[PDB]
Amino acid sequence: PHDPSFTPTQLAARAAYLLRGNDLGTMTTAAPLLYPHMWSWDAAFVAIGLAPLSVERAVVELDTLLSAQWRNGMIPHIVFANGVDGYFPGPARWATATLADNAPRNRLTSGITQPPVHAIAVQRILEHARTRGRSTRAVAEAFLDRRWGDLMRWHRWLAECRDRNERGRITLYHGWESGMDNSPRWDSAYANVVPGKLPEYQRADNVIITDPSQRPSDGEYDRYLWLLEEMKAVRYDDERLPSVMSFQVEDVFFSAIFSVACQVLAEIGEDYKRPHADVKDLYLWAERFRAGVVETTDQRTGAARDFDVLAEKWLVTETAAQFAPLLCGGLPHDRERALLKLLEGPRFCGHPDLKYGLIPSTSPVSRDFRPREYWRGPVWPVLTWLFSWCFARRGWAERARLLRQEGLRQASDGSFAAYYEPFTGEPLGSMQQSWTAAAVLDWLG
Amino acid sequence: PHDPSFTPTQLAARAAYLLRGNDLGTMTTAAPLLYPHMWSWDAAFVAIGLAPLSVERAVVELDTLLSAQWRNGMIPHIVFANGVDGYFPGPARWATATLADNAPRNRLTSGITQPPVHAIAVQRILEHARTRGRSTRAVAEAFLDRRWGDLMRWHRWLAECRDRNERGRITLYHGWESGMDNSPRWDSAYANVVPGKLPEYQRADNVIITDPSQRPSDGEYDRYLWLLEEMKAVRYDDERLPSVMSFQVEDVFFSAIFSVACQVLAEIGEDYKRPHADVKDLYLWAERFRAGVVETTDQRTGAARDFDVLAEKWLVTETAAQFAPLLCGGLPHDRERALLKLLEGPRFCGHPDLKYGLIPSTSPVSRDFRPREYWRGPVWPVLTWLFSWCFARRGWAERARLLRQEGLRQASDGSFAAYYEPFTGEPLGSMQQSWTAAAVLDWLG
Amino acid sequence: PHDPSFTPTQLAARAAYLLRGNDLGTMTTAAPLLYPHMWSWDAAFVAIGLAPLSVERAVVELDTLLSAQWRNGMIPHIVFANGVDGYFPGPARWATATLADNAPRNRLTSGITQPPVHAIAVQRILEHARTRGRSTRAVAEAFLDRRWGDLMRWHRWLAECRDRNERGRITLYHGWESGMDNSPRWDSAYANVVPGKLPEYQRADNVIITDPSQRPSDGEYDRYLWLLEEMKAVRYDDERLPSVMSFQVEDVFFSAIFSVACQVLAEIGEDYKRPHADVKDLYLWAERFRAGVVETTDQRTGAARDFDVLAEKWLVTETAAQFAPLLCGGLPHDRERALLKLLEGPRFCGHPDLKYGLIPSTSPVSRDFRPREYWRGPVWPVLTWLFSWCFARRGWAERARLLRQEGLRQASDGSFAAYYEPFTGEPLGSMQQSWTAAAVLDWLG
Amino acid sequence: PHDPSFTPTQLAARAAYLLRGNDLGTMTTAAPLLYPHMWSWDAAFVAIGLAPLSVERAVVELDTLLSAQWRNGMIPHIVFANGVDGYFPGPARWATATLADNAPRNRLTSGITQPPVHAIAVQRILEHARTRGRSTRAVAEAFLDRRWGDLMRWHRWLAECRDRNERGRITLYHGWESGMDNSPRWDSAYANVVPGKLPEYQRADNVIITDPSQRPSDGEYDRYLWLLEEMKAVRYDDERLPSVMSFQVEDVFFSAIFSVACQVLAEIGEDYKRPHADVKDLYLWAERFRAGVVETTDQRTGAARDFDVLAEKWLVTETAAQFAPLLCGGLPHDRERALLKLLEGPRFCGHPDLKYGLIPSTSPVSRDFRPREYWRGPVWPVLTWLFSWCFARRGWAERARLLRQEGLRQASDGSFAAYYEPFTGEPLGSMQQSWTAAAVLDWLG
């Protein structure tokens, strides 16, 4: 009625109730019907949201994801729930269990990756555990003993297999790997993907989300699905993908995340007396990908650019990803002030028509902006959380506080949507998204 | 470490996480292992705790309980979960499905009842629903259309079958029906229960709670189980129980609760335009059981007494139940002040060694007091909740606030135990008790 | 910015900062410029707001007001600050120090009274004091020993000199005594006030509040000032006022407050062992005025009516005073339900255009409604507080909680205005009003 | 009662009430009786506590302090309230108005300085102002135009007159200038202060704080007062002090604060387009003093050391000043990790006997530790606040949050003491200390 919003305690309660409701036992679905399996970077956020409720169950979430890690170290972006249908492309379409030498045994997974936020969830689990006493500490530490090697293999796979030329940037072979499926970042790269004879399919995502303005188009799905055919034709062989993939881009946002994740994991390794050779490698990669992100940046504004490896051309777009250097650091002082000015000004957080002071996925003044269409404009709580946590780690305590405060105010409707209309605040996409509940739980403390 | 307690938002989150974790689908276990089925007055508290999370799921909890209501109106105190073991006495021991003409079809239940707090949960669901908008209101109101008749039948069964002589007090045939299994209230009545040839059994409750100081003794369980044999021998026939039961007491606390519940349900009936004949009956019963509670009271202190129907004697004990008149009203002004003085003084809430200003189940100065032993002394959050809600309804806003504040401070460890050691605050009994999570969720708002 | 509202801790801090800022030493001004003196019922609310900050200073506030008590027991409505100007009518206009034999020595005061909320403030001080331990309790208890007789003489003067016929209603001789200066309630009584040669004067209130729509008119002020001339002509003699005053009304809202105050004071008197003769008179008055209030009510709706003693007719208006019987109790059950329906429906709190679910001073559907004009429509936090506190005392916990929640939400801009535009929420009148800061402090706890 | 602690809203209210109560009009006293004047770094903290209440009044506090700035740029450590006595040494003892050519006109001040936390207060005022909209921003920005030059001259006088050899450390001539009057840090420098004929005097501090264990000794005060005699003999002339002062130490904690302050002011200067020459000097000073602090540190532990200029030796003590390098940065990675280990281990925050996880002024295991004796062991909320704010600025969000949480928990008794017994939590010294109320206000938000 007069105010549909919840008090902080009611909101924290409903967020926890949602997370437990999406729990299948050892994995949490990313959303009840739209995404009824475990997604890789959602799972890292889910573990962050579970850490204040049960360190034991947070550790189980990451254990389940890492039990699905490929033999070469890749963490796949989907871990399918056994017997669960209603999402396409499903395990039969991927065919990794039959085609991929490196796929895991006794887990069904996708054949592509997703951003490495996992070290950040590990840090949040350890910080919670240290406040809870000896038995909880022992649980977190036993997780580190058991999974430190797997986490190194994950980071080593990204550094060696997706940065073969030691450029300090991660190459993607599918826009889904960026986490930002239909971002304007990838449009010119996708315009050069030409599907051959693509085997028939029917979408399931728009059976659940039926408003066509909130999901990608059929044409885009045709190209997403064709990339799978190219990968399957070389049996997901790392050494053959550069020769056959019609889509090869360096993702500067993914790269900045990895730089931060490496630095975070190195600090964990020093704190918990892990092998010194591992710590040294992690710091080396943190600095390499820091330098690789800075190398992309606009000389006047500091804005970071993606790179089309096939066209050999910088990709200039006005999306939230151009703020990648703020997460990892490395810009000369003057260019970082200009970048912060871009972020806070009327092209992004300071745009006059925004309901909240939050980062829209695409600038509202760009021609590519669509207020409802997924990553082409809507405000995503997950991005708010990540920028706020990274800003606090840069020492920008008031900036991080302001993002948290506006994220909580947006989330106070209790819809736990994945993204929101930037001008009206209408929730969009699936309600009951686990990683939005998790961001709220982490923010509320 | 330095403070093991949780912030209000962390506590609300953990309470909601617990409640969803105990959800089997359409019923919530009272506790994970000790009480792995639905209990009647726990279920009413569970619905109160769910109301701020999901009015739809709160209504489902009460629907599931009422689908197990007996044909004569009795709400049984256990609704067993199909296929679930580990609690004794289980459905085979009760044998209501085969022996009891009035038992429900397609639910397994016990053969005794428990206090009628259900109307209070209905009120809390309606108050939540009215703050949430039209579709949520429609859910609550549709529950009333569907279940008003069942709620009347429940109240009518208590008024006509457990108060056959219109004394305005409820007769119990088992101490389990009071909710206070081993309370000192029932000791002299139980000393006159003599088991005949009692069929062999093994306890399950002390397999889970192994500290013998926190559960009833074998001798007590022998008498609890023998009462079942007396009931089974007359096939749970209402008309035969007065002739065969070795245990027949009027429970003044149960009676005060019923008086309040009748008044609450009458007000609901007027608000939602239910049949006027039903409303008039409810008000008639509210006043009858009010007068029946007052008739028991000590002339100097206002303390309410239970009555042994077989011995025809008043039962004088120093437990929390002697504060029954405060819940329902009816005492002359002067005797109610004396009763409040008893409650707040050094025999109860003002005892100098209590960790919290809360109501111990038995007075710490009584010879019957045992600080660990179930209802013989420990502080129960459920009683705190009930006294605080009833006090607020009497208009004693500061008294109700003080009980809430101390209940939250006791619960801030996040153990959600059913009862606590009164002097040390050590949690006792089962951890993860649903109705303690529910009281916390309701208090926190 | 995006959110001009303050957090609960920021709002409590600002309210306390305001209250200390309006403190002249032993008295607190009602507002810095518009009301730079001590007003009687404002000081009662100020003492309530001070009690969480300093029981000693809260008691000082009531000590200072009672030091200005007249010899017949009347608490005058203004205690003027020595040396302060800028308010009209000031002490020279009242001339009480010259004319009124009953006026106090070494205090300058007005010559009329205001509603008796003081006992309520005493209850709140005592409640706070009992949570703070022994030396704070001594302070509050020493105040009771010091001022019990004065409080008794205040109540006795109301019961005997302003209810000379034992009708259970308080007679007023000025609309200012109601606290609701320009209420539609008094329009037809004021229409029969015809001033003679009125000594010239210049208003000061509208030099500070310059928007003419927020204060009464010059014609209204000419009648206010003429009644002063009538009172001065009989030297404020009680026995002579009925013979000369052109304005004599029974104020049902003032009477309901008095009934409540008497009941509160009687209970205090019992708890602290005051003379029995006093407690008995206080209960007698509480009931007489409860009955006097109910005698005014409409048989169908329960709406309470004021009474014009000179015209000998019921004053039928659509203002918040209609709900007088909800504060003090006493209506038949059906009639009280009808009155709550009026309060919650579209003529008051349910009006669809209201920004908050709060009680407007005049019904938006009444022809008398003026959205900006003082007591002719605006929402006053002081009424919100008083209705909420009295509702909680009736046992209507949820109704009291809703008013408190909407009051805090309206207050959270930090203006601490005395009244707000009902549709837009715009603050009106003076900002920095002490009793609005007090209500916020008491609500926030 | 059972809980003498205050809720967060009650505590914010009481803190704000205290701060307004210590307001003399344009200055706030450090404490009502012990320190009834304006102290320099207290006023910086007071302005931080005022910023959530009134940006205008926060700016007044710094305006008043800067109006007492000496002509050479020095901010003196006391600005005396006109007409107030009860503190010794008072203005007659300092005699600055007579002797010091650089002393201000129409202000009475001391003749020594105190740490430069003022730029930090400026940042907090600006941060608050930017959340309050345009007219509040104008206030803060007009203050910057008014006082930027004065702030520059304050920093320039520190860099040029108290670091005459460009060593990047501040030289002090009195232990009072460190803010840590009786710290063990200065014990061996004070042992070489031998007073001559000292003019008689009577202490006032220990007439108010009478427990001798909470204040320095008479022998200590005789040395404090003798250094005044030395300064007065050269008429507080900067160029002459090195030739005559018996106490000359480089204060590494003061230096670390200055480095931070310079960096803060430089960033403010960039954001508000101050002269480039000024911003460049501020960054130069920030780095010089960062390097000067690191030059003092132990190679294994990172602990920072003070330096006795006269004795020409490092002062090795176990106090909170050792952690100077954590505030300003600059240590090698390994050495900073060792220093955090010292801070968190059993010699400081990890000591098993501490009631709160806070930084004691002197290590409990040091032979110099005295649990009640001022800066020789007690926990000071002002240090908690300053370490927490500086930790957040380093990016150590969780470490800053833990200090804030334990500080609020220690403060929640509402004493607002300046220091607390480290083992029992007993408040010590003066209650009603303004900068403890300020820290609480800033923490609570």
Ligand SMILES: O=C(O)[C@@H](CO)O[C@H]1O[C@H](CO)[C@@H](O)[C@H](O)[C@@H]1O
């Ligand atoms: O649309 C899809 O089918 C998936 C493909 O992975 O993308 C979304 O679904 C995932 C589950 O929420 C998210 O992690 C991604 O960021 C993205 O929003």
Ligand SMILES: O=C(O)[C@@H](CO)O[C@H]1O[C@H](CO)[C@@H](O)[C@H](O)[C@@H]1O
């Ligand atoms: O001990 C048992 O086996 C059951 C019998 O019903 O009693 C407890 O178990 C129930 C489940 O919590 C409670 O409702 C009762 O109040 C009581 O505490």
Ligand SMILES: O=C(O)[C@@H](CO)O[C@H]1O[C@H](CO)[C@@H](O)[C@H](O)[C@@H]1O
């Ligand atoms: O306008 C005035 O001159 C004074 C006269 O008493 O009235 C208001 O001012 C007083 C101080 O706020 C209040 O007690 C009253 O409610 C009233 O609204």
Ligand SMILES: O=C(O)[C@@H](CO)O[C@H]1O[C@H](CO)[C@@H](O)[C@H](O)[C@@H]1O
């Ligand atoms: O004891 C004294 O006479 C004064 C001298 O300056 O010192 C304290 O008093 C001042 C006011 O609290 C503080 O600024 C200092 O930290 C110090 O603790």
